[PDB]
Amino acid sequence: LPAPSYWKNERGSELLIWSANSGTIQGTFTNHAQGFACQGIPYPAAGSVSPTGLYFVVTFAQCNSFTRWVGTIKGSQMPTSWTLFYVDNKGKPSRLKGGDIFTRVW
Numbered sequence: 001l002p003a004p005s006y007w008k009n010e011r012g013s014e015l016l017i018w019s020a021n022s023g024t025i026q027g028t029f030t031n032h033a034q035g036f037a038c039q040g041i042p043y044p045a046a047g048s049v050s051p052t053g054l055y056f057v058v059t060f061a062q063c064n065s066f067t068r069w070v071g072t073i074k075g076s077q078m079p080t081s082w083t084l085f086y087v088d089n090k091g092k093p094s095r096l097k098g099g100d101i102f103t104r105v106w
Contacts, residue, residue: 001025001049007078007102009033015056015102020049029058036084037063054078069100078102 001020008014011033018026027045031038038060047056047069054073059066065086071079084096 001054001073002104005104006106007104009100009102011100013100015045017045023048023050025049025054025056027056029056031060037065071100076104078104 001017003017003020003025005017006014007017013032014030016028018028020026025045025047027047028042029045030040030042032040041060043058043060045056045058047054053071055068055070057066057068063086065084067082067084069080069082071081078101080100080102082098082100084098086094086096088094
């Protein structure tokens with residue numbers, strides 16, 4: 001995991017990695033995915049990298065949700081699967097799952 005580096009998924013969401021010093025990544029993530037909330041506001045991304053791959057979690061405080069991405073790096077690309085947890089407007093906890101491929105821009 002190169003640090004600093006800047007990666008973007010296919011939706012346009014951005015991940016800036018500041019450091020990965022001892023298997024613990026610190027980053028900033030901003031959502032731009034159409035139809036997901038908190039678009040445009042940067043949030044800390046935290047997680048871990050190792051032999052087995054990596055994961056990072058971002059809590060979009062103030063749309064009351066967080067997503068965890070898990071994946072690996074392969075050259076310039078980082079394929080991931082994610083699970084998003086949030087609370088709907090009737091107050092029911094809800095989860096959503098999907099895949100992302102982030103590709104390095106610088």
